[PDB]
Protein backbone atom coordinates (compact mmCIF):
# COMPACT_ATOMS: atom_id res chain seq x y z
CA UNK A 1 0.00 0.00 0.00
CA UNK A 2 1.08 3.50 -0.31
CA UNK A 3 1.18 3.84 3.72
CA UNK A 4 3.66 0.77 3.55
CA UNK A 5 5.70 2.22 0.73
CA UNK A 6 6.45 5.56 2.15
CA UNK A 7 7.25 3.75 5.45
CA UNK A 8 9.78 1.83 3.64
CA UNK A 9 11.00 4.93 1.90
CA UNK A 10 11.92 6.15 5.46
CA UNK A 11 13.00 3.44 7.18
CA UNK A 12 16.05 3.03 3.90
CA UNK A 13 16.29 7.08 3.81
CA UNK A 14 17.82 7.89 7.31
CA UNK A 15 16.15 10.37 7.93
CA UNK A 16 12.12 11.34 9.20
CA UNK A 17 9.60 11.86 6.28
CA UNK A 18 6.30 14.30 6.24
CA UNK A 19 3.79 13.99 3.69
CA UNK A 20 0.99 15.56 2.81
CA UNK A 21 -1.08 15.10 -0.42
CA UNK A 22 -4.75 16.60 -0.85
CA UNK A 23 -6.17 15.58 -3.89
CA UNK A 24 -8.72 18.52 -4.88
CA UNK A 25 -11.26 15.90 -7.27
CA UNK A 26 -12.57 14.53 -3.50
CA UNK A 27 -10.66 16.16 -1.25
CA UNK A 28 -9.22 12.89 -0.26
CA UNK A 29 -5.95 13.07 1.69
CA UNK A 30 -2.57 11.14 1.80
CA UNK A 31 -1.01 11.50 5.32
CA UNK A 32 2.45 10.22 6.48
CA UNK A 33 3.79 12.04 9.71
CA UNK A 34 1.60 14.97 8.36
CA UNK A 35 0.34 16.09 12.09
CA UNK A 36 4.25 16.39 12.70
CA UNK A 37 6.36 19.64 12.67
CA UNK A 38 9.40 20.05 10.28
CA UNK A 39 11.41 23.53 9.88
CA UNK A 40 9.86 24.78 6.90
CA UNK A 41 13.31 26.62 5.50
CA UNK A 42 12.82 28.74 2.09
CA UNK A 43 9.60 26.99 2.23
CA UNK A 44 8.16 29.93 4.71
CA UNK A 45 8.73 31.96 1.83
CA UNK A 46 5.71 31.22 0.29
CA UNK A 47 4.05 32.67 3.35
CA UNK A 48 6.06 35.75 3.22
CA UNK A 49 5.58 36.55 -0.74
CA UNK A 50 1.56 35.85 -0.43
CA UNK A 51 1.42 38.69 2.90
CA UNK A 52 2.67 41.32 0.54
CA UNK A 53 0.62 39.91 -2.25
CA UNK A 54 -2.87 40.00 0.17
CA UNK A 55 -1.44 44.17 1.33
CA UNK A 56 -1.27 44.42 -2.35
CA UNK A 57 -4.78 44.39 -2.38
CA UNK A 58 -5.34 47.15 -0.52
CA UNK A 59 -2.69 49.09 -2.04
CA UNK A 60 -2.36 49.36 -5.90
CA UNK A 61 0.52 51.01 -6.07
CA UNK A 62 2.14 48.29 -3.62
CA UNK A 63 3.80 45.76 -5.98
CA UNK A 64 5.69 48.40 -8.12
CA UNK A 65 7.06 49.98 -5.30
CA UNK A 66 11.32 50.26 -5.07
CA UNK A 67 13.16 48.62 -2.46
CA UNK A 68 16.70 50.00 -2.41
CA UNK A 69 19.16 47.05 -2.43
CA UNK A 70 22.85 47.89 -0.41
CA UNK A 71 25.67 46.00 -0.09
CA UNK A 72 25.07 45.08 3.29
CA UNK A 73 21.63 43.63 2.61
CA UNK A 74 23.17 40.65 0.96
CA UNK A 75 23.64 37.00 3.40
CA UNK A 76 24.72 33.71 2.14
CA UNK A 77 22.35 32.95 -0.87
CA UNK A 78 20.98 36.03 -3.35
CA UNK A 79 21.84 35.65 -6.66
CA UNK A 80 19.26 38.10 -7.80
CA UNK A 81 19.10 41.00 -5.04
CA UNK A 82 23.62 40.71 -5.86
CA UNK A 83 22.42 41.85 -9.50
CA UNK A 84 21.07 44.80 -8.25
CA UNK A 85 23.24 46.49 -5.44
CA UNK A 86 23.41 49.86 -5.60
CA UNK A 87 20.15 49.86 -7.39
CA UNK A 88 16.14 48.96 -6.88
CA UNK A 89 13.91 46.32 -6.73
CA UNK A 90 10.33 46.04 -6.82
CA UNK A 91 8.21 44.07 -4.02
CA UNK A 92 7.44 41.95 -6.81
CA UNK A 93 10.51 41.97 -8.19
CA UNK A 94 11.41 40.54 -3.91
CA UNK A 95 8.84 37.92 -4.59
CA UNK A 96 9.96 36.61 -7.84
CA UNK A 97 13.36 36.71 -7.00
CA UNK A 98 12.64 35.28 -3.22
CA UNK A 99 10.37 32.25 -4.91
CA UNK A 100 11.91 32.04 -8.16
CA UNK A 101 15.33 31.32 -6.99
CA UNK A 102 15.45 31.48 -3.21
CA UNK A 103 16.91 34.75 -2.77
CA UNK A 104 17.22 34.76 0.90
CA UNK A 105 17.83 38.97 0.61
CA UNK A 106 14.67 38.96 -1.27
CA UNK A 107 12.90 36.94 1.98
CA UNK A 108 14.45 39.47 3.96
CA UNK A 109 13.55 42.56 2.08
CA UNK A 110 9.84 41.06 2.13
CA UNK A 111 9.89 40.47 6.19
CA UNK A 112 11.20 43.94 6.98
CA UNK A 113 8.80 45.66 4.71
CA UNK A 114 6.01 43.56 6.72
CA UNK A 115 7.42 44.33 9.91
CA UNK A 116 9.34 41.01 10.94
CA UNK A 117 8.26 37.63 10.85
CA UNK A 118 5.94 37.91 13.57
CA UNK A 119 3.79 39.74 11.16
CA UNK A 120 4.33 36.80 8.61
CA UNK A 121 2.42 34.41 11.12
CA UNK A 122 -0.29 36.95 11.52
CA UNK A 123 -0.89 36.77 8.48
CA UNK A 124 -0.99 32.67 8.25
CA UNK A 125 -3.29 33.11 11.11
CA UNK A 126 -5.14 34.81 9.04
CA UNK A 127 -5.98 32.30 7.12
CA UNK A 128 -6.91 30.10 9.47
CA UNK A 129 -3.36 28.36 9.58
CA UNK A 130 -3.23 27.97 13.45
CA UNK A 131 0.18 25.34 12.78
CA UNK A 132 2.66 27.77 10.61
CA UNK A 133 5.38 30.19 12.48
CA UNK A 134 7.74 32.14 11.34
CA UNK A 135 10.29 33.06 14.18
CA UNK A 136 13.40 34.34 12.37
CA UNK A 137 14.47 36.29 9.30
CA UNK A 138 17.14 34.25 6.61
CA UNK A 139 19.35 32.53 6.56
CA UNK A 140 18.90 31.28 10.57
CA UNK A 141 14.84 30.69 9.97
CA UNK A 142 16.59 27.47 8.12
CA UNK A 143 18.69 25.98 11.34
CA UNK A 144 15.98 23.35 10.97
CA UNK A 145 17.34 21.96 14.59
CA UNK A 146 15.78 19.17 15.81
CA UNK A 147 13.03 19.72 18.18
CA UNK A 148 13.10 23.31 17.70
CA UNK A 149 9.47 24.87 17.06
CA UNK A 150 10.95 27.88 15.27
CA UNK A 151 9.94 28.59 11.94
CA UNK A 152 8.04 25.26 11.45
CA UNK A 153 4.03 23.61 10.66
CA UNK A 154 3.32 20.38 9.94
CA UNK A 155 2.68 19.04 6.34
CA UNK A 156 -0.77 18.87 6.67
CA UNK A 157 -1.40 22.44 7.64
CA UNK A 158 1.15 23.50 5.12
CA UNK A 159 -0.91 21.80 2.10
CA UNK A 160 -3.73 22.93 3.50
CA UNK A 161 -2.63 26.63 3.42
CA UNK A 162 -1.38 26.16 0.04
CA UNK A 163 -4.04 24.86 -1.44
CA UNK A 164 -5.89 27.51 0.45
CA UNK A 165 -3.38 30.30 -1.38
CA UNK A 166 -3.16 28.93 -4.78
CA UNK A 167 -6.76 27.04 -5.50
CA UNK A 168 -8.81 28.86 -2.67
CA UNK A 169 -10.22 31.50 -0.87
CA UNK A 170 -6.99 33.33 0.58
CA UNK A 171 -6.63 35.85 -2.08
CA UNK A 172 -8.06 38.02 -4.39
CA UNK A 173 -8.04 36.46 -8.02
CA UNK A 174 -4.93 38.57 -9.41
CA UNK A 175 -3.14 37.99 -6.70
CA UNK A 176 -3.69 34.27 -6.45
CA UNK A 177 -2.76 34.08 -9.88
CA UNK A 178 0.20 35.91 -9.20
CA UNK A 179 1.16 33.80 -6.68
CA UNK A 180 0.58 30.79 -8.94
CA UNK A 181 2.49 32.77 -11.97
CA UNK A 182 5.47 32.74 -8.98
CA UNK A 183 5.51 29.27 -8.17
CA UNK A 184 5.19 27.73 -11.54
CA UNK A 185 8.21 29.48 -12.84
CA UNK A 186 10.58 28.40 -9.98
CA UNK A 187 13.50 27.45 -11.07
CA UNK A 188 15.16 25.37 -8.27
CA UNK A 189 12.97 22.32 -7.83
CA UNK A 190 13.90 20.12 -10.92
CA UNK A 191 15.06 17.32 -8.97
CA UNK A 192 12.56 17.33 -6.02
CA UNK A 193 8.98 17.00 -6.44
CA UNK A 194 8.95 17.56 -10.04
CA UNK A 195 11.27 15.06 -10.87
CA UNK A 196 8.88 12.46 -9.33
CA UNK A 197 5.92 13.59 -12.00
CA UNK A 198 5.08 12.78 -15.67
CA UNK A 199 7.07 15.74 -17.41
CA UNK A 200 3.92 16.80 -19.04
CA UNK A 201 2.39 17.63 -16.07
CA UNK A 202 1.95 21.38 -14.73
CA UNK A 203 3.87 22.21 -11.47
CA UNK A 204 3.94 25.34 -9.40
CA UNK A 205 6.36 24.38 -6.18
CA UNK A 206 8.82 26.10 -3.44
CA UNK A 207 11.62 23.88 -1.97
CA UNK A 208 13.57 24.63 0.99
CA UNK A 209 16.92 23.25 2.37
CA UNK A 210 18.46 23.70 5.68
CA UNK A 211 20.73 22.18 8.25
CA UNK A 212 20.32 18.90 9.40
CA UNK A 213 20.02 17.22 5.25
CA UNK A 214 16.22 19.43 5.77
CA UNK A 215 15.41 18.87 2.38
CA UNK A 216 11.47 20.24 1.33
CA UNK A 217 9.13 20.85 -1.38
CA UNK A 218 5.79 22.50 -1.19
CA UNK A 219 3.87 22.07 -4.54
CA UNK A 220 0.61 22.17 -6.39
CA UNK A 221 -0.22 19.98 -9.93
CA UNK A 222 -1.88 19.77 -12.53
CA UNK A 223 -2.48 16.32 -14.00
CA UNK A 224 -3.53 16.94 -17.86
CA UNK A 225 -6.89 15.39 -17.31
CA UNK A 226 -7.55 15.41 -13.63
CA UNK A 227 -8.10 18.04 -10.71
CA UNK A 228 -5.21 19.38 -9.17
CA UNK A 229 -3.79 17.94 -6.34
CA UNK A 230 -1.49 19.88 -3.67
CA UNK A 231 1.72 18.22 -2.01
CA UNK A 232 4.13 18.50 0.95
CA UNK A 233 6.71 17.01 1.42
CA UNK A 234 9.25 17.41 4.18
CA UNK A 235 12.77 15.62 4.77
CA UNK A 236 14.59 15.61 7.93
CA UNK A 237 17.79 14.19 9.20
CA UNK A 238 19.43 13.45 12.42
CA UNK A 239 23.15 14.95 11.85
CA UNK A 240 23.23 18.93 11.53
CA UNK A 241 25.37 17.95 8.48
CA UNK A 242 23.83 15.13 6.86
CA UNK A 243 23.57 16.02 2.59
CA UNK A 244 19.86 17.12 1.62
CA UNK A 245 18.29 14.25 -0.14
CA UNK A 246 16.00 15.61 -2.81
CA UNK A 247 16.07 12.27 -4.27
CA UNK A 248 13.73 11.32 -1.51
CA UNK A 249 11.24 13.89 -1.72
CA UNK A 250 11.03 12.81 -5.87
CA UNK A 251 10.38 9.16 -4.86
CA UNK A 252 7.37 9.75 -2.15
CA UNK A 253 6.11 12.07 -4.90
CA UNK A 254 5.81 9.28 -7.53
CA UNK A 255 4.45 7.08 -4.48
CA UNK A 256 1.32 9.13 -3.78
CA UNK A 257 0.75 9.93 -6.92
CA UNK A 258 0.42 6.76 -8.63
CA UNK A 259 -2.84 6.75 -10.24
CA UNK A 260 -3.74 10.18 -10.64
C1 LIG B 1 15.88 28.02 2.25
O1 LIG B 1 15.64 26.92 2.73
C2 LIG B 1 17.31 28.53 2.05
N1 LIG B 1 18.38 27.63 2.56
C3 LIG B 1 19.50 28.18 3.08
O2 LIG B 1 19.71 29.41 2.99
C4 LIG B 1 20.37 27.22 3.75
N2 LIG B 1 20.86 26.06 3.19
O3 LIG B 1 20.46 25.85 1.81
C5 LIG B 1 21.44 25.00 1.26
C6 LIG B 1 20.83 27.40 5.15
C7 LIG B 1 20.67 28.63 5.93
S1 LIG B 1 21.24 28.47 7.50
C8 LIG B 1 21.74 26.90 7.21
N3 LIG B 1 22.37 26.08 8.16
N4 LIG B 1 21.45 26.51 5.96
C9 LIG B 1 17.51 28.72 0.44
N5 LIG B 1 16.76 27.70 -0.27
C10 LIG B 1 17.12 26.97 -1.33
C11 LIG B 1 16.10 25.83 -1.70
O4 LIG B 1 16.39 24.64 -1.51
O5 LIG B 1 15.01 26.22 -2.20
C12 LIG B 1 18.39 27.29 -2.07
C13 LIG B 1 18.70 26.55 -3.15
C14 LIG B 1 19.25 28.37 -1.68
S2 LIG B 1 19.21 29.11 -0.04
Redesign the pocket.
Known amino acids: SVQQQLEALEKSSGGRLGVALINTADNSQILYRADERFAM ?3 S ?1 VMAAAAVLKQSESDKHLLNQRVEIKKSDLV ?2 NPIAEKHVNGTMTLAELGAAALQY ?1 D ?1 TAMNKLIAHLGGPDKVTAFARSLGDETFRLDRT ?3 L ?3 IPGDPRDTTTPLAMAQTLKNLTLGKALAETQRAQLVTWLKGNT ?2 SASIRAGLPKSWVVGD ?6 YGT ?2 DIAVIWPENHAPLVLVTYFTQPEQKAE ?1 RRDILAAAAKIVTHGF
Not at 206 to 211: E, F, I, P, R
Request: proline share 4%; net charge positive; hydrophobic share 10%.
Open positions: CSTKNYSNAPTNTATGKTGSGDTNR
